[PDB]
Coordinates of all heavy atoms in Angstrom, one line a residue:
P1 N -9.6 5.3 -2.9 CA -10.8 5.6 -2.2 C -11.5 4.3 -1.8 O -11.6 3.4 -2.5 CB -11.6 6.4 -3.3 CG -11.1 5.8 -4.6 CD -9.6 5.3 -4.3
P2 N -12.2 4.4 -0.5 CA -13.0 3.3 0.0 C -14.0 2.8 -0.9 O -14.7 3.6 -1.6 CB -13.4 3.8 1.3 CG -13.3 5.2 1.4 CD -12.2 5.6 0.4
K3 N -14.2 1.4 -0.9 CA -15.1 0.8 -1.9 C -16.6 1.4 -1.6 O -17.2 1.7 -0.5 CB -15.3 -0.7 -1.5 CG -15.7 -1.1 -0.2 CD -15.9 -2.6 0.0 CE -16.4 -3.0 1.3 NZ -17.7 -2.5 1.6
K4 N -17.4 1.6 -2.8 CA -18.7 2.1 -2.7 C -19.6 0.9 -2.7 O -19.7 0.3 -3.7 CB -18.9 3.0 -3.9 CG -20.1 4.0 -3.7 CD -21.4 3.2 -3.9 CE -22.7 4.1 -3.5 NZ -22.7 5.3 -4.3
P5 N -20.3 0.7 -1.7 CA -21.3 -0.5 -1.5 C -22.4 -0.6 -2.6 O -22.8 0.7 -2.9 CB -21.9 -0.4 -0.2 CG -20.9 0.5 0.6 CD -20.1 1.4 -0.4
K6 N -22.7 -1.6 -3.2 CA -23.7 -1.6 -4.1 C -25.2 -1.8 -3.6 O -25.3 -2.5 -2.6 CB -23.5 -2.9 -5.1 CG -22.2 -2.9 -5.8 CD -22.1 -1.7 -6.7 CE -20.7 -1.5 -7.3 NZ -19.6 -1.2 -6.3
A18 N -29.7 -3.9 6.5 CA -28.9 -3.7 7.7 C -27.4 -3.8 7.6 O -26.7 -2.9 7.9 CB -29.4 -4.6 8.9
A19 N -27.0 -4.8 6.8 CA -25.5 -5.0 6.5 C -25.2 -3.9 5.5 O -24.1 -3.4 5.7 CB -25.4 -6.4 5.9
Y20 N -26.1 -3.5 4.6 CA -25.8 -2.4 3.7 C -25.7 -1.1 4.5 O -24.7 -0.4 4.2 CB -27.0 -2.3 2.8 CG -26.8 -1.1 1.8 CD1 -25.8 -1.1 0.7 CD2 -27.6 0.1 1.9 CE1 -25.7 0.0 -0.1 CE2 -27.5 1.2 1.1 CZ -26.4 1.1 0.1 OH -26.4 2.3 -0.7
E21 N -26.5 -1.0 5.5 CA -26.3 0.3 6.4 C -25.1 0.3 7.1 O -24.4 1.4 7.3 CB -27.6 0.4 7.4 CG -28.8 0.7 6.8 CD -28.8 2.0 6.0 OE1 -28.8 2.9 6.6 OE2 -28.9 1.8 4.7
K22 N -24.5 -0.9 7.6 CA -23.2 -1.0 8.3 C -22.1 -0.7 7.3 O -21.1 0.0 7.6 CB -23.2 -2.3 9.0 CG -21.8 -2.4 9.8 CD -21.7 -3.8 10.5 CE -20.4 -3.9 11.3 NZ -20.5 -5.1 12.1
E23 N -22.2 -1.3 6.2 CA -21.2 -1.0 5.0 C -21.2 0.3 4.6 O -20.1 1.0 4.4 CB -21.5 -1.9 3.9 CG -21.1 -3.5 4.0 CD -19.7 -3.7 4.6 OE1 -18.8 -3.3 3.9 OE2 -19.7 -4.2 5.7
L24 N -22.3 1.1 4.5 CA -22.5 2.4 4.3 C -22.0 3.3 5.2 O -21.2 4.2 5.0 CB -23.8 2.8 3.9 CG -24.1 4.2 3.4 CD1 -23.2 4.5 2.1 CD2 -25.5 4.4 3.0
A25 N -22.2 3.0 6.5 CA -21.7 3.6 7.7 C -20.2 3.6 7.7 O -19.5 4.5 7.9 CB -22.2 3.0 9.0
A26 N -19.7 2.4 7.5 CA -18.2 2.1 7.3 C -17.6 3.0 6.3 O -16.6 3.6 6.4 CB -18.0 0.7 7.1
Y27 N -18.3 3.1 5.0 CA -17.9 3.8 3.9 C -17.9 5.3 4.4 O -16.9 6.1 4.0 CB -18.8 3.7 2.7 CG -18.6 4.7 1.6 CD1 -17.6 4.5 0.6 CD2 -19.4 5.8 1.5 CE1 -17.4 5.3 -0.4 CE2 -19.2 6.7 0.4 CZ -18.1 6.5 -0.5 OH -18.0 7.3 -1.5
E28 N -18.9 5.8 5.1 CA -18.9 7.1 5.6 C -17.8 7.4 6.6 O -17.1 8.5 6.5 CB -20.3 7.5 6.3 CG -21.5 7.5 5.2 CD -22.7 7.9 5.9 OE1 -23.5 7.1 6.5 OE2 -23.0 9.1 5.8
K29 N -17.5 6.5 7.5 CA -16.4 6.7 8.4 C -15.0 6.7 7.7 O -14.2 7.7 7.9 CB -16.4 5.5 9.4 CG -17.6 5.5 10.4 CD -17.5 4.3 11.3 CE -18.6 4.3 12.3 NZ -19.9 4.1 11.6
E30 N -14.8 5.7 6.8 CA -13.5 5.6 6.0 C -13.4 6.8 5.1 O -12.3 7.2 4.8 CB -13.4 4.3 5.4 CG -13.3 3.0 6.3 CD -13.3 1.8 5.6 OE1 -14.4 1.3 5.2 OE2 -12.2 1.3 5.3
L31 N -14.6 7.3 4.7 CA -14.5 8.5 3.7 C -14.1 9.7 4.5 O -13.4 10.5 3.9 CB -15.8 8.6 3.1 CG -16.0 9.7 1.9 CD1 -15.1 9.3 0.7 CD2 -17.4 10.0 1.5
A32 N -14.7 9.9 5.7 CA -14.3 11.1 6.5 C -12.8 11.0 6.9 O -12.1 12.0 7.0 CB -15.2 11.2 7.7
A33 N -12.4 9.8 7.2 CA -10.9 9.5 7.6 C -10.0 9.8 6.3 O -9.1 10.4 6.5 CB -10.8 8.1 8.0
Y34 N -10.4 9.4 5.2 CA -9.7 9.6 4.1 C -9.5 11.1 3.5 O -8.5 11.5 3.5 CB -10.2 8.7 2.8 CG -9.4 8.7 1.5 CD1 -8.3 8.0 1.4 CD2 -9.8 9.6 0.5 CE1 -7.5 8.0 0.1 CE2 -9.1 9.8 -0.7 CZ -8.0 8.8 -0.8 OH -7.2 9.0 -2.0

Side-chain angles (χ1 to χ4, degrees):
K3 67 178 180 57
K4 198 287 170 57
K6 300 298 174 296
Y20 177 75
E21 290 302 284
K22 183 177 182 178
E23 289 304 299
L24 184 55
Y27 171 82
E28 293 186 272
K29 292 181 180 62
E30 295 178 274
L31 186 68
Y34 183 81

